[PDB]
Amino acid sequence: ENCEREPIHIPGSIQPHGALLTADGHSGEVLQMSLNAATFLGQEPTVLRGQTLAALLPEQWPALQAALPPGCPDALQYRATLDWPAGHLSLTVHRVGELLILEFEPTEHALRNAMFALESAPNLRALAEVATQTVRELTGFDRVMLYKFAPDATGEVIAEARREGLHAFLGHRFPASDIPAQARALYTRHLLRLTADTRAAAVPLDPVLNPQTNAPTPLGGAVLRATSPMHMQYLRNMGVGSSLSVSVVVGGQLWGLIACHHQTPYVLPPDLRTTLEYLGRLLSLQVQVKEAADVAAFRQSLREHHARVALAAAHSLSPHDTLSDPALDLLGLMRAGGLILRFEGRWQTLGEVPPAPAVDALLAWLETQPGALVQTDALGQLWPAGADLAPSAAGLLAISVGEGWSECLVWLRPELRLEVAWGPRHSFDTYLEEKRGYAEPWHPGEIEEAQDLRDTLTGALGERLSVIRDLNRALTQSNA
Amino acid sequence: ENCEREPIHIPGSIQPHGALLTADGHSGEVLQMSLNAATFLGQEPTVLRGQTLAALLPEQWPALQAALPPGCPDALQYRATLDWPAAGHLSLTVHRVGELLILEFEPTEHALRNAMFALESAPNLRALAEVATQTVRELTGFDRVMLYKFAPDATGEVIAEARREGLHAFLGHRFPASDIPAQARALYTRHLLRLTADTRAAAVPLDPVLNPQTNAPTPLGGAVLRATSPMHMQYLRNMGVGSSLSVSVVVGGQLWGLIACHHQTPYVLPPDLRTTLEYLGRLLSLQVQVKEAADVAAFRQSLREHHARVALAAAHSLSPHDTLSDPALDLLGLMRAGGLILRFEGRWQTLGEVPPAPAVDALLAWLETQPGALVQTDALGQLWPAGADLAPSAAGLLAISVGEGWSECLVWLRPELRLEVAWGPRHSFDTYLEEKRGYAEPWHPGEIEEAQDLRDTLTGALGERLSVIRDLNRALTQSNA
Numbered sequence: 001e002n003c004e005r006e007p008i009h010i011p012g013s014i015q016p017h018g019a020l021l022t023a024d025g026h027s028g029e030v031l032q033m034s035l036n037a038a039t040f041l042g043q044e045p046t047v048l049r050g051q052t053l054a055a056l057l058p059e060q061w062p063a064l065q066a067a068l069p070p071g072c073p074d075a076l077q078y079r080a081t082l083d084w085p086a087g088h089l090s091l092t093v094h095r096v097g098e099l100l101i102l103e104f105e106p107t108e109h110a111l112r113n114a115m116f117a118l119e120s121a122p123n124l125r126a127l128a129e130v131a132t133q134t135v136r137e138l139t140g141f142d143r144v145m146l147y148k149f150a151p152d153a154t155g156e157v158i159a160e161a162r163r164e165g166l167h168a169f170l171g172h173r174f175p176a177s178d179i180p181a182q183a184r185a186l187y188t189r190h191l192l193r194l195t196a197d198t199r200a201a202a203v204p205l206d207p208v209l210n211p212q213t214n215a216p217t218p219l220g221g222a223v224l225r226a227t228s229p230m231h232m233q234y235l236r237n238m239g240v241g242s243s244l245s246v247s248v249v250v251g252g253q254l255w256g257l258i259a260c261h262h263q264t265p266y267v268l269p270p271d272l273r274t275t276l277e278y279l280g281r282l283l284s285l286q287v288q289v290k291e292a293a294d295v296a297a298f299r300q301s302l303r304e305h306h307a308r309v310a311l312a313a314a315h316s317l318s319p320h321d322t323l324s325d326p327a328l329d330l331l332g333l334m335r336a337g338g339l340i341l342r343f344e345g346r347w348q349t350l351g352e353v354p355p356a357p358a359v360d361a362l363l364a365w366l367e368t369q370p371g372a373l374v375q376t377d378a379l380g381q382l383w384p385a386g387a388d389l390a391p392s393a394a395g396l397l398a399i400s401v402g403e404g405w406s407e408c409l410v411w412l413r414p415e416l417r418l419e420v421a422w423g424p425r426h427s428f429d430t431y432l433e434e435k436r437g438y439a440e441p442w443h444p445g446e447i448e449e450a451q452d453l454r455d456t457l458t459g460a461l462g463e464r465l466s467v468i469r470d471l472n473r474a475l476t477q478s479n480a
Numbered sequence: 481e482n483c484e485r486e487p488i489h490i491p492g493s494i495q496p497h498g499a500l501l502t503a504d505g506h507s508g509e510v511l512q513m514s515l516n517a518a519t520f521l522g523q524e525p526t527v528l529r530g531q532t533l534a535a536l537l538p539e540q541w542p543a544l545q546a547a548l549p550p551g552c553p554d555a556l557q558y559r560a561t562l563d564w565p566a567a568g569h570l571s572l573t574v575h576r577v578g579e580l581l582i583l584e585f586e587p588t589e590h591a592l593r594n595a596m597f598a599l600e601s602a603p604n605l606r607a608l609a610e611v612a613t614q615t616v617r618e619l620t621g622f623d624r625v626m627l628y629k630f631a632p633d634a635t636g637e638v639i640a641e642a643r644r645e646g647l648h649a650f651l652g653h654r655f656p657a658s659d660i661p662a663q664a665r666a667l668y669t670r671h672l673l674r675l676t677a678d679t680r681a682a683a684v685p686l687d688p689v690l691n692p693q694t695n696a697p698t699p700l701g702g703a704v705l706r707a708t709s710p711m712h713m714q715y716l717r718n719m720g721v722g723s724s725l726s727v728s729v730v731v732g733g734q735l736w737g738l739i740a741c742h743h744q745t746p747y748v749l750p751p752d753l754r755t756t757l758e759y760l761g762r763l764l765s766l767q768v769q770v771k772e773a774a775d776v777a778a779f780r781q782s783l784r785e786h787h788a789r790v791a792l793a794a795a796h797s798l799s800p801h802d803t804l805s806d807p808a809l810d811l812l813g814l815m816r817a818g819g820l821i822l823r824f825e826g827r828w829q830t831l832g833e834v835p836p837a838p839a840v841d842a843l844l845a846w847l848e849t850q851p852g853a854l855v856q857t858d859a860l861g862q863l864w865p866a867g868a869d870l871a872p873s874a875a876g877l878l879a880i881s882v883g884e885g886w887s888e889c890l891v892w893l894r895p896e897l898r899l900e901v902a903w904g905p906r907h908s909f910d911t912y913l914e915e916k917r918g919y920a921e922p923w924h925p926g927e928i929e930e931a932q933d934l935r936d937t938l939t940g941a942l943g944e945r946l947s948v949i950r951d952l953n954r955a956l957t958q959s960n961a
């Protein structure tokens with residue numbers, strides 16, 4: 001119930017497969033330190049506590065402070081490899097406030113070929129398939145998926161690269177409840193996340209509170225962050241050991257999220273994580289290319305039909321006489337059953353349309369809607385009173401030429417029934433309850449041609465204005 | 481004069497620091513081969529000619545043909561490293577044009593990850609440009625490393641530099657469209673890397689020159705060992721430049737910019753570091769789309785308080801003249817202009833310092849003939865030759881047509897300012913010197929985005945005004961009847 005208010009940013013504990021130290025970003029005096037760090041680094045904790053970073057790491061300090069000035073964001077990272085008698089470790093540092101955060105992990109042509117493979121993917125399906133195929137090759141994970149977040153905050157499993165002897169997760173959809181808001185904010189900032197074990201116990205820090213502020217330490221930028229005790233339980237019921245997610249951020253929005261699950265507890269080398277980090281950058285880029293090609297190809301086919309409607313609405317002195325002529329046919333362009341044409345006051349219908357008292361109720365609903373365009377494939381969801389009028393009007397596309405919904409075109413698609421079918425299964429049942437009655441979902445190539453008719457009709461709303469005044473001016477001349 | 485029609489794609493010769501073979505992409509029979517390849521590979525040419533690739537490279541073939549199916553674009557590349565007794569271990573790079581596999585041979589022997597995060601945390605486009613160039617100079621060890629930015633009038637502008645001490649700066653340098661022709665720009669959009677190891681070295685021909693498959697010259701656009709033009713070399717010889725490496729920046733299918741790394745002494749880079757640069761090219765094409773998006777969004781934020789007062793008043797604009805001339809709004813200060821023209825319904829109204837009336841009616845006649853929705857110029861003397869003497873009041877122009885046809889239009893006028901650029905690159909510089917005479921303050925892209933946001937709210941009111949005018953006619957007829 002109150003699982004959306006849990007502070008994920010402040011666990012106060014780390015994952016037991018490395019070491020963590022946080023120290024003041026001016027003095028270098030060691031403040032906070034995990035319990036395990038004494039055994040890991042192979043030094044007495046009394047020595048480490050109250051020691052400068054100029055003493056412990058005497059060569060890395062004049063490089064650490066240079067690359068990390070006070071003022072830089074807590075997204076900037078600095079990696080280094082150093083040798084210790086206790087073998088050679090991995091050092092990863094960053095800066096929060098005036099506190100340097102040190103991370104320690106034990107360390108020990110495929111990328112270039114993958115790059116060109118992604119750049120020469122024909123569509124978004126093939127890009128998704130290849131990306132997942134590459135990840136499974138380099139890492140050697142069992143299951144590797146790719147969610148795509150719908151603008152109603154629901155994930156959709158579009159691709160998979162699985163091991164033989166496991167059921168497919170393809171086509172799976174999960175609600176907004178599983179990924180809360182505070183998690184989504186953190187995943188927009190920090191692109192990588194790693195969980196080596198799900199049944200392992202968290203290692204606390206000593207002392208827990210940062211004496212600089214007397215406040216808990218924010219460890220959002222840390223890879224060794226202990227994961228939620230609810231998300232672990234979720235993966236325990238399925239029986240999943242390792243989890244690695246790489247977030248896809250497009251235009252400052254969380255596009256999608258690769259998830260790499262494993263049956264057995266697994267710890268990945270930090271040399272291969274960097275390769276994945278690179279792939280995350282490459283997959284955020286190419287998605288913006290492939291989805292741009294998905295619409296541009298779709299529009300190209302219908303453009304011959306589109307140009308006849310656009311040029312006729314360009315010199316539209318009559319909105320009724322030209323935009324109702326069957327030689328244009330506005331139903332076939334958008335693949336819809338019904339069309340409503342409301343101009344000047346008179347409402348005109350074309351094709352299969354709901355009854356007249358319901359029409360005047362539908363146009364009353366669109367006026368109350370603040371948006372310029374109304375896009376819905378289920379009108380029963382948005383408008384509860386107009387759910388019985390689905391047989392003729394299930395999917396709706398409405399544009400207001402001008403503003404105020406005085407002059408508007410409405411597209412109506414026929415009714416089609418949809419039923420969802422497949423602990424992930426109790427999350428699946430919440431998605432099952434939401435959907436009842438739907439229609440054919442709107443293609444984004446159609447939306448771009450729908451809003452291109454808006455720009456040529458409203459441009460004619462100015463040419464129409466001129467001659468109307470002229471008719472008034474000539475009338476007054478005849479009156480005088 | 482006819483240097484824009486030169487076939488750069490077909491040199492018929494290669495650069496002398498490697499080896500090249502082109503063979504049929506089904507049989508594997510060796511067709512074309514450079515003269516140097518006999519000495520380089522350490523085998524007799526008679527043996528190599530009329531030999532299958534299954535015999536010469538017996539392990540790489542079932543990997544070569546798999547990664548390169550017939551049908552894939554000639555942009556896909558495959559790199560491999562293989563050991564040879566003659567010259568040590570070499571670098572193998574293959575691709576596919578038509579039904580002809582193209583083999584390239586060159587002798588081979590934490591900075592990147594840190595650079596990545598440095599680029600992702602750059603505050604602006606100036607700082608991104610500075611860091612990128614600083615990184616390249618560190619990894620490669622070139623003398624001069626620049627970064628051109630192509631202006632939408634096809635002119636390069638040196639924005640950043642990472643130079644060696646004891647050399648004059650190239651910062652602020654600008655060069656015309658003549659130096660980089662069209663056929664070069666097409667090739668640089670496709671193939672992102674280019675390498676010239678020496679400028680005074682002689683080109684090594686292929687034997688035989690013509691591909692017997694088609695009886696046509698071999699297109700080597702995707703090849704790194706392509707011999708560069710005998711005119712571009714001469715250009716770099718006059719300056720005295722040895723090595724040249726360029727990495728092209730392509731944004732949205734358009735050539736954004738081009739890193740250029742020049743060197744005084746002949747230099748050959750290892751192929752292991754070229755791949756790092758190739759990666760940096762990908763990272764710099766990405767982050768530019770982020771930084772330039774932040775440059776305008778920050779600029780608009782400051783002026784948004786002034787912008788919102790103009791937008792809401794033009795939203796319920798029943799009168800275009802009465803509301804969009806009120807000094808409480810002040811449309812001059814928003815766009816930082818001297819003059820403003822307000823033409824609506826037929827009557828032209830002026831605000832601030834404006835040209836004489838016969839010149840005004842000439843200016844509005846010019847904008848009607850212009851096909852574009854928005855006219856953006858900082859020099860009106862360039863676009864309109866008759867209106868060059870009217871620069872003291874109208875030098876820079878920003879015009880928007882609410883609706884279409886230039887019936888109702890707003891015109892912004894910026895005052896006259898002289899700018900002069902001052903410094904074989906010098907004869908190319910003189911062609912840029914002749915172009916500019918009289919200018920104004922150049923338009924900020926943050927202003928253009930607010931200028932076109934006033935278009936969308938005024939034209940939306942062109943529809944609301946329409947309704948009530950007819951209503952007044954309809955009520956009149958009712959009273960008449």
Ligand SMILES: C=CC1=C(C)/C(=C\c2[nH]c(/C=C3N=C(/C=C4\NC(=O)C(C)=C4C=C)C(C)=C\3CCC(=O)O)c(CCC(=O)O)c2C)NC1=O
Pocket residue numbers: 003004008174177178179180183186193227228230231234243245257258259424427
């Ligand atoms: C196929 C399996 C399957 C999963 C993994 C799923 C949910 C799910 N929960 C996530 C995050 C999360 N989910 C939770 C927590 C919860 N977990 C819950 O399901 C509930 C009820 C809570 C409580 C609010 C939190 C806090 C995170 C983010 C953890 C982090 O910050 O790393 C993520 C994104 C990160 C990842 O891939 O690990 C997924 C996909 N639904 C599915 O069907």
Ligand SMILES: C=CC1=C(C)/C(=C\c2[nH]c(/C=C3N=C(/C=C4\NC(=O)C(C)=C4C=C)C(C)=C\3CCC(=O)O)c(CCC(=O)O)c2C)NC1=O
Pocket residue numbers: 483484488655658659660661664667674708709711712715724726738740905908
């Ligand atoms: C100080 C440096 C400086 C140069 C180098 C310049 C122009 C210039 N010409 C270029 C390409 C080119 N320039 C030429 C050729 C020519 N060269 C000429 O200046 C003329 C007259 C021709 C003939 C048209 C060709 C053919 C290319 C493309 C070569 C390729 O495809 O790699 C490039 C991009 C590739 C590179 O840098 O190697 C630049 C920057 N003007 C300058 O200010």
